[PDB]
Design a protein around this ligand. Structure first.
Ligand SMILES: CC(=O)N[C@H]1[C@H]([C@H](O)[C@H](O)CO)O[C@](O)(C(=O)O)C[C@@H]1O
Length: 309
């Protein structure tokens, strides 16, 4: 094609993210009259999300996904998006990004410093905790060998609840669970399904601890080369795909608990009051480390009412 573009992702071919990326690719190909073809590179073929963000910056990959929170790697205050229990729901996540001074500035910096254009934002589920033994209360976390991604906020979730974290890439998790090298992991329900973690985890606990969004990002080096009518095709397709993406996750959350039960998984509902209490010293450490910018980001986010209006 005139533009042989590539979209890298960590998720696999059975995931909601992949299905939404397929919708995006199809719409772009059709509405560009075949000028643009987007090929998909799932399952961390190209590296993890940190690697893929570098590749968008240098123009060697055209599209990828990232969470708003992942930008903590560059702007420490952006950890606010994944401080456990701070962002209440997706309504808050949307407003935090697009309707705060903090979030608007972040989007501008992503364009200036990191070489990426934000096309759209979707919901990517609320993270829960799976394990090889029951989590009936916070006490069961103590010393649980909890896999986390290579992200400071997830590492802190594990530490402050009393678990023993083991960071590793997403691709490595199924093996680690299967062999009981670790005792559990934490991810939204849809990823537990997509990766078939239910095959290698007998328990799931509704810890509700981190809210994930999902940004459709394009390399500036690619986006600048597209004539403006094709930029519009891409932007509009990303917005349409993100609405579909969100819907896939909202519907999965409704029924996935009963899917897992049918697969033999035992679901627990630990009391979250001590989980939330356990994060208070972590918030204090975030404020100490990130200073006025972090205090401000917190304040701006805590001011957002979570009810749709
Ligand atoms: C956009 C993206 O790549 N998301 C990935 C996230 C983030 O890397 C992580 O939450 C840090 O931001 O980690 C996973 O949930 C995980 O490894 O468990 C896989 C998911 O596909």
């Amino acid at each position: 094609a005139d533009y042989d573009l590539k979209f890298g992702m960590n998720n696999g071919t059975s995931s909601n993210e992949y299905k939404a990326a397929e919708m995006f690719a199809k719409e772009v190909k059709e509405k560009s009259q075949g000028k643009i073809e987007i090929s998909l590179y799932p399952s961390s073929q190209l590296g993890d999300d940190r690697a893929m963000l570098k590749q968008l910056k240098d123009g060697s990959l055209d599209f990828t996904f990232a969470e708003s929170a992942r930008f903590q790697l560059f702007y420490p205050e952006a950890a606010v998006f994944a401080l456990p229990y701070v962002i209440s729901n997706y309504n808050v996540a949307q407003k935090a990004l697009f309707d705060t001074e903090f979030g608007k500035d972040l989007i501008k910096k992503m364009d200036k410093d990191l070489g990426v254009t934000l096309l759209s934002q979707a919901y990517n589920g609320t993270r829960q905790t799976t394990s090889n033994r029951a989590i009936n209360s916070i006490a069961d976390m103590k010393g649980l060998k909890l896999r986390v991604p290579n992200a400071a906020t997830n590492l802190a979730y594990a530490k402050y609840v009393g678990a023993s974290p083991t960071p590793m890439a997403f691709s490595e998790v199924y093996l680690a669970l299967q062999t009981n090298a670790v005792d559990g992991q934490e991810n939204p329900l849809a990823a537990v399904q997509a990766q078939k973690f239910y095959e290698v985890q007998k328990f799931l606990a509704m810890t509700n601890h981190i809210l994930n969004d999902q940004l459709y990002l394009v390399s500036n080096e690619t986006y600048k080369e597209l004539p403006e009518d094709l930029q519009k095709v891409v932007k509009d397709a990303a917005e349409n795909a993100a609405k579909y993406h969100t819907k896939l996750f909202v519907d999965g959350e409704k029924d996935l608990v009963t899917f897992f039960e049918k697969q033999g998984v035992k679901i627990t509902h630990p009391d979250l009051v001590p989980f939330k209490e356990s994060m208070k010293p972590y918030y204090a450490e975030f404020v100490k480390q990130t200073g006025q910018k972090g205090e401000s980001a917190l304040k701006q986010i805590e001011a957002i009412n979570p009810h749709h209006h």
